[PDB]
Design a protein around this motif. Structure first.
Motif, PDB file in Angstrom:
ATOM      1  N   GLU A 238       0.617  -0.944  -0.053  1.00  0.00           N
ATOM      2  CA  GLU A 238       0.232   0.182   0.027  1.00  0.00           C
ATOM      3  C   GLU A 238       1.032   1.045   0.194  1.00  0.00           C
ATOM      4  OE1 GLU A 238      -3.913  -0.002  -0.043  1.00  0.00           O
ATOM      5  OE2 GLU A 238      -2.136  -1.299  -0.440  1.00  0.00           O
ATOM      6  N   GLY A 239       1.881   1.110   0.595  1.00  0.00           N
ATOM      7  CA  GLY A 239       2.827   2.775   0.619  1.00  0.00           C
ATOM      8  C   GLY A 239       3.410   2.843  -0.423  1.00  0.00           C
ATOM      9  N   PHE A 240       4.330   1.496  -0.876  1.00  0.00           N
ATOM     10  CA  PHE A 240       4.604   1.671  -2.418  1.00  0.00           C
ATOM     11  C   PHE A 240       3.595   2.078  -3.249  1.00  0.00           C
ATOM     12  CE2 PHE A 240       6.094   0.052  -6.792  1.00  0.00           C
ATOM     13  CZ  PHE A 240       7.677   0.136  -6.577  1.00  0.00           C
ATOM     14  N   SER A 241       2.761   1.215  -3.518  1.00  0.00           N
ATOM     15  CA  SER A 241       1.686   2.119  -4.512  1.00  0.00           C
ATOM     16  C   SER A 241       1.839   3.492  -4.247  1.00  0.00           C
ATOM     17  CB  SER A 241       0.709   0.955  -4.007  1.00  0.00           C
ATOM     18  OG  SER A 241       0.698  -0.535  -4.794  1.00  0.00           O
ATOM     19  N   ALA A 242       1.131   4.509  -3.239  1.00  0.00           N
ATOM     20  CA  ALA A 242       0.639   5.473  -3.341  1.00  0.00           C
ATOM     21  C   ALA A 242       1.951   6.265  -3.313  1.00  0.00           C
ATOM     22  CB  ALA A 242       0.277   5.475  -1.854  1.00  0.00           C
ATOM     23  N   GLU A 243       3.411   6.054  -2.696  1.00  0.00           N
ATOM     24  CA  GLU A 243       4.259   6.891  -2.824  1.00  0.00           C
ATOM     25  C   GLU A 243       5.043   6.666  -4.460  1.00  0.00           C
ATOM     26  OE1 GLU A 243       4.922   8.893  -0.534  1.00  0.00           O
ATOM     27  OE2 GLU A 243       3.410   8.023   0.238  1.00  0.00           O
ATOM     28  N   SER A 244       5.140   5.547  -4.565  1.00  0.00           N
ATOM     29  CA  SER A 244       5.838   5.829  -5.790  1.00  0.00           C
ATOM     30  C   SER A 244       5.144   5.730  -7.274  1.00  0.00           C
ATOM     31  CB  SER A 244       5.882   3.670  -6.493  1.00  0.00           C
ATOM     32  OG  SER A 244       5.267   4.097  -7.189  1.00  0.00           O
ATOM     33  N   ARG A 245       3.495   6.217  -7.060  1.00  0.00           N
ATOM     34  CA  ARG A 245       3.204   6.963  -8.152  1.00  0.00           C
ATOM     35  C   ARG A 245       3.166   8.097  -7.485  1.00  0.00           C
ATOM     36  N   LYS A 246       3.158   9.302  -6.768  1.00  0.00           N
ATOM     37  CA  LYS A 246       4.070  10.461  -6.528  1.00  0.00           C
ATOM     38  C   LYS A 246       4.873  10.483  -7.308  1.00  0.00           C
ATOM     39  CE  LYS A 246       2.051  10.543  -2.108  1.00  0.00           C
ATOM     40  NZ  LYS A 246       1.637  10.566  -0.613  1.00  0.00           N
ATOM     41  N   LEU A 247       6.158  10.016  -7.111  1.00  0.00           N
ATOM     42  CA  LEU A 247       7.034   9.832  -7.579  1.00  0.00           C
ATOM     43  C   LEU A 247       7.217   9.213  -9.528  1.00  0.00           C
ATOM     44  CD1 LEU A 247      10.349  10.146  -7.419  1.00  0.00           C
ATOM     45  CD2 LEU A 247      10.618   7.762  -6.768  1.00  0.00           C
ATOM     46  N   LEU A 248       6.001   8.795  -9.512  1.00  0.00           N
ATOM     47  CA  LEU A 248       6.082   9.010 -11.336  1.00  0.00           C
ATOM     48  C   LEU A 248       5.751  10.536 -11.779  1.00  0.00           C
ATOM     49  CD1 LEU A 248       6.603   7.179 -13.583  1.00  0.00           C
ATOM     50  CD2 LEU A 248       4.111   6.123 -13.204  1.00  0.00           C
ATOM     51  N   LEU A 249       4.596  10.372 -11.358  1.00  0.00           N
ATOM     52  CA  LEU A 249       4.045  11.673 -11.695  1.00  0.00           C
ATOM     53  C   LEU A 249       5.471  13.337 -11.998  1.00  0.00           C
ATOM     54  CD1 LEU A 249       0.756  11.882 -10.314  1.00  0.00           C
ATOM     55  CD2 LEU A 249       1.925  11.150 -12.463  1.00  0.00           C
ATOM     56  N   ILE A 250       6.035  13.299 -10.846  1.00  0.00           N
ATOM     57  CA  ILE A 250       6.627  14.315 -10.741  1.00  0.00           C
ATOM     58  C   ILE A 250       8.306  13.779 -12.003  1.00  0.00           C
ATOM     59  CG2 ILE A 250       9.185  14.662  -9.200  1.00  0.00           C
ATOM     60  CD1 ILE A 250       7.102  14.775  -6.473  1.00  0.00           C
ATOM     61  N   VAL A 251       8.682  12.809 -11.868  1.00  0.00           N
ATOM     62  CA  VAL A 251       9.491  12.099 -12.731  1.00  0.00           C
ATOM     63  C   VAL A 251       8.934  12.270 -14.525  1.00  0.00           C
ATOM     64  CG1 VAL A 251      10.408  10.517 -14.234  1.00  0.00           C
ATOM     65  CG2 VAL A 251      10.813  10.799 -11.693  1.00  0.00           C
ATOM     66  N   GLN A 252       7.407  12.301 -14.598  1.00  0.00           N
ATOM     67  CA  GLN A 252       7.263  12.557 -15.860  1.00  0.00           C
ATOM     68  C   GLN A 252       7.183  14.023 -15.952  1.00  0.00           C
ATOM     69  OE1 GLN A 252       3.419   9.949 -15.827  1.00  0.00           O
ATOM     70  NE2 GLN A 252       4.321   8.944 -17.503  1.00  0.00           N
ATOM     71  N   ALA A 253       6.335  15.006 -14.642  1.00  0.00           N
ATOM     72  CA  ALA A 253       6.416  16.231 -15.278  1.00  0.00           C
ATOM     73  C   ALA A 253       7.926  16.643 -15.732  1.00  0.00           C
ATOM     74  CB  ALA A 253       5.848  17.108 -14.608  1.00  0.00           C
ATOM     75  N   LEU A 254       9.791  15.823 -15.151  1.00  0.00           N
ATOM     76  CA  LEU A 254      10.480  16.230 -15.618  1.00  0.00           C
ATOM     77  C   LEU A 254      10.968  16.225 -17.163  1.00  0.00           C
ATOM     78  CD1 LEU A 254      12.445  15.836 -12.359  1.00  0.00           C
ATOM     79  CD2 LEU A 254      11.959  17.927 -12.692  1.00  0.00           C
ATOM     80  N   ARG A 255      10.191  14.441 -16.994  1.00  0.00           N
ATOM     81  CA  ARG A 255      11.010  14.317 -18.528  1.00  0.00           C
ATOM     82  C   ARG A 255      10.426  14.716 -19.915  1.00  0.00           C
ATOM     83  N   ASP A 256       9.053  15.335 -19.190  1.00  0.00           N
ATOM     84  CA  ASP A 256       8.739  16.152 -20.370  1.00  0.00           C
ATOM     85  C   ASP A 256       9.316  17.829 -21.272  1.00  0.00           C
ATOM     86  OD1 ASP A 256       6.974  13.241 -20.679  1.00  0.00           O
ATOM     87  OD2 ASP A 256       5.285  14.327 -19.887  1.00  0.00           O
ATOM     88  N   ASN A 257       8.917  17.803 -19.562  1.00  0.00           N
ATOM     89  CA  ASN A 257       9.488  19.751 -19.644  1.00  0.00           C
ATOM     90  C   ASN A 257      11.099  19.746 -19.244  1.00  0.00           C
ATOM     91  OD1 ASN A 257       6.634  20.534 -19.696  1.00  0.00           O
ATOM     92  ND2 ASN A 257       6.337  19.435 -18.112  1.00  0.00           N
TER      93      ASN A 257
END
Ligand SMILES: Fc1ccc(-n2ccnc2)cc1
Length: 408
Positions: free
Chosen positions: A357-376
């Motif tokens: 449960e922790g990994f699922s929520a917490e790694s989604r947050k790190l993902l969106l942050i990484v996706q916003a840095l990769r696109d921009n």
């Protein structure tokens, strides 16, 4: 920065029943006096195998009493032999409260091992039997509309034979049997067959026995109260190849089986994986609801078809499931995408854990942050995620996958 997985001995199997390593004794088109009662089915399944032999420990449990596990299996056989001698076969079988059963019923960083990825690959494969009926998926009160119907039939065609679906139905059966016994036989060490049911490619109904569980006393006042149990599961897997996987088990060699293979007829040893374990009312209720994995997976597919459909101002259902803008399918086929989503949902259920449960929520947050840095074109979030990477094989494997989505 890739996440740091923990170091240590390899992680070990922790599901409630065997997955890729299970082995079924089966009866085709069953029709004995009492077809549909678990105990009758189990006996008829046991009577199909003639290769039993004097059992012995081949992989000992390092922290339990291995003579007691041996005695418990021999007791199961002895009490099933008793039912053979009673004129009327009973509907259920309550085991004698022997010393071995009383003992067995209770009366650390781990690195990622390769077996859990193999388990996941096996869960995505197709078996040669179907495990659900055509209208299994869904709860709707009304008749479903035309688009929804088409989508359900396409999806069901892809996942009905999937191994993940066998795990769903296996898990639904045993969790229902155990929860019912938990309240219908509170004081008894009831013998509870592990059964599943499927239909072959020729339409033949088949009944399968994976093994047995014996429940302890179960005066379950609340959802979190625990009922202990002993599981005894047939397998052709020699536990001496990946002993780390079986840290929680005592493994017996209990017979020899004749098999068709690529080299023709072969005799292979049959094993029995034995461990003690426990579950609660709430976990058994969740286990009875595993068919929602089918619905949750379908809904992820329906989300992708809705996206493409609102892009083309047109329904894209036929075009999505028949593979007609995209010029391929990364997993290889639409069928594999369906079965991969299904397998993820089933393993999330079979390997539920606060770590997950922790990994699922917490790694989604790190993902969106990484996706916003990769696109921009953070040290406290990385810690919240790695505080869940301790010893759980499913979580560790999902972290391994996350690192791959980081390197790309
Ligand atoms: F249904 C069965 C019950 C017992 C045995 N069995 C095997 C060795 N001893 C007992 C086989 C089938």
């Amino acid at each position: 920065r890739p996440l740091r997985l923990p170091d240590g001995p390899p992680c070990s199997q922790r599901s409630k029943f065997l997955l890729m390593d299970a082995l079924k004794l089966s009866i085709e088109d069953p029709s004995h006096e009492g077809e549909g009662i678990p105990l009758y089915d189990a006996i008829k399944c046991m009577r199909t195998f003639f290769g039993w032999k004097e059992p012995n420990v081949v992989k000992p449990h390092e922290k339990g009493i291995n003579p007691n596990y041996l005695l418990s299996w021999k007791q199961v056989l002895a009490e099933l032999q008793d039912i053979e001698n009673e004129e009327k076969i009973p509907r259920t079988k309550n085991m004698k409260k022997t010393s071995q059963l009383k003992w067995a019923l209770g009366e650390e960083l781990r690195s990622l091992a390769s077996w859990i990825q193999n388990e996941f690959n096996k869960a995505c494969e197709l078996t040669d039997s179907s495990w659900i009926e055509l209208d299994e998926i869904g709860e709707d009160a009304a008749p479903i509309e035309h688009i929804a119907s088409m989508r359900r039939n396409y999806f069901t065609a892809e996942v009905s034979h999937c191994r993940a679906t066998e795990y769903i139905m296996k898990g639904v059966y045993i969790n229902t049997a155990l929860l019912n016994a938990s309240c219908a036989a509170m004081d008894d060490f009831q013998l509870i067959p592990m059964i599943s049911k499927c239909r072959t490619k020729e339409g033949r109904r088949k009944t399968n026995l994976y093994g047995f569980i014996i429940k302890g006393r179960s005066h379950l006042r609340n959802d979190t109260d625990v009922v202990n149990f002993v599981s005894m599961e047939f397998s052709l897997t020699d536990p001496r190849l990946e002993p780390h996987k079986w840290e929680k088990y005592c493994v017996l060699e209990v017979g020899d089986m004749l098999l068709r293979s690529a080299i023709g007829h072969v005799s292979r040893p049959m094993f029995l994986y034995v461990r003690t374990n426990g579950t609660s009312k709430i976990k058994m209720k969740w286990g009875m609801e595993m068919r929602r994995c089918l619905l949750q997976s379908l809904q992820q597919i329906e989300s992708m078809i809705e996206a493409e459909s609102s892009v083309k101002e047109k329904d894209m259902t036929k075009e999505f499931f028949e593979n007609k803008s995209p010029k391929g399918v990364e997993e290889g086929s639409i069928g594999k995408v369906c079965r991969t989503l299904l397998a993820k949902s089933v393993f999330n259920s079979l390997y539920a854990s606060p770590q997950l449960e922790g990994f699922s929520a917490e790694s989604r947050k790190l993902l969106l942050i990484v996706q916003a840095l990769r696109d921009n074109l953070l040290g406290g979030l990385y810690e919240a995620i790695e505080e869940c990477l301790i010893n759980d094989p499913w979580v560790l494997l999902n972290a391994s996958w996350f690192n791959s989505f980081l390197t790309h």
